[PDB]
Structure 1
Amino acid sequence: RKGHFSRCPKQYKHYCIKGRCRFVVAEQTPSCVCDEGYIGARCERVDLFY
């Protein structure tokens, strides 16, 4: 319909520091989306101060 999946909790977000992730249980699809204004491979740096 719109987005009925499982949101990744901060406790399990070790693959992304400043990035969220949507894990689909019914259809096994683990996808991590980092902040658009972020920088670094592990989402450590950022491109937005104010």
Structure 2
Amino acid sequence: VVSHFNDCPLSHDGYCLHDGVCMYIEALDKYACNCVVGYIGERCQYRDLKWWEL
């Protein structure tokens, strides 16, 4: 679908943990959260420690 792109609502890191990157997908009219690198769990809660303590 052709939609215009806007940002995520006020509770952007609401369900999406560790400051999760909430975005809209304009093409499909869906939402998602993208996770940062070195963060683990299905919900992206935790940090992988080993690279820090190197």
TM-score by length of 2: 0.52
Relative distance call for 1:36 and 1:9 in structure 2 (3 A) is farther
* Structure with the bigger percentage of strand: 1
Are the aligned partners of 1:5 and 1:22 in contact in 2 as well (CA < 8 Å)? no
- Structure 2 stretches lacking a partner, 5+ long: none
**Root mean square deviation, CA, Å:** 2.9
- Structure 1 stretches lacking a partner, 5+ long: none
Are the aligned partners of 1:23 and 1:30 in contact in 2 as well (CA < 8 Å)? yes
**36-45 or 12-21, which deviates more:** 12-21
Are the aligned partners of 1:6 and 1:24 in contact in 2 as well (CA < 8 Å)? no
Counterpart of 1:49? Answer: 52
Identical counterparts, % of pairs: 38
Report the Cα distance in structure 1 between the residues aligned to 2:31 and 2:47, rounded to whole angstroms.
Answer: 23
Number of residue pairs aligned between Structure 1 and Structure 2: 47
